[PDB]
Amino acid sequence: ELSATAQEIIKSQAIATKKIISDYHQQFRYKLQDFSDQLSDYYEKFIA
C-alpha cells in the first residue's frame, strides 16, 4: 500500500512539474519575442 501511494504521488507530481516547466518555457519564449520586436524602433522613438 505504501509503495502504491508513493507511486501515485510521484506520478501526480511529475506531470504537474512538466506542465509548469512547459508553461514557463513558453512564457520565456514569448517574452523573448516581445523584447526582440520592441528592440526595433528605439532610434525612431528617440528622434520623434
UniProtKB/Swiss-Prot annotation:
It comes from the Eukaryota. Palmitoylated; structural requirement for proper assembly of the hydrophobic core of the lipoprotein particle. Induction: Up-regulated in response to enterovirus 71 (EV71) infection (at protein level). It is found in: Cytoplasm; Secreted; Lipid droplet. Apolipoprotein B is a major protein constituent of chylomicrons (apo B-48), LDL (apo B-100) and VLDL (apo B-100). Apo B-100 functions as a recognition signal for the cellular binding and internalization of LDL particles by the apoB/E receptor. Interacts with PCSK9. Interacts with MTTP. Interacts with AUP1. Interacts with CIDEB. It is linked to Hypobetalipoproteinemia, familial, 1: A disorder of lipid metabolism characterized by less than 5th percentile age- and sex-specific levels of low density lipoproteins, and dietary fat malabsorption. Clinical presentation may vary from no symptoms to severe gastrointestinal and neurological dysfunction similar to abetalipoproteinemia. Hypercholesterolemia, familial, 2: A form of hypercholesterolemia, a disorder of lipoprotein metabolism characterized by elevated serum low-density lipoprotein (LDL) cholesterol levels, which result in excess deposition of cholesterol in tissues and leads to xanthelasma, xanthomas, accelerated atherosclerosis and increased risk of premature coronary heart disease. FHCL2 inheritance is autosomal dominant. This is Apolipoprotein B-100. It comes from Homo sapiens (Human). The gene is APOB.
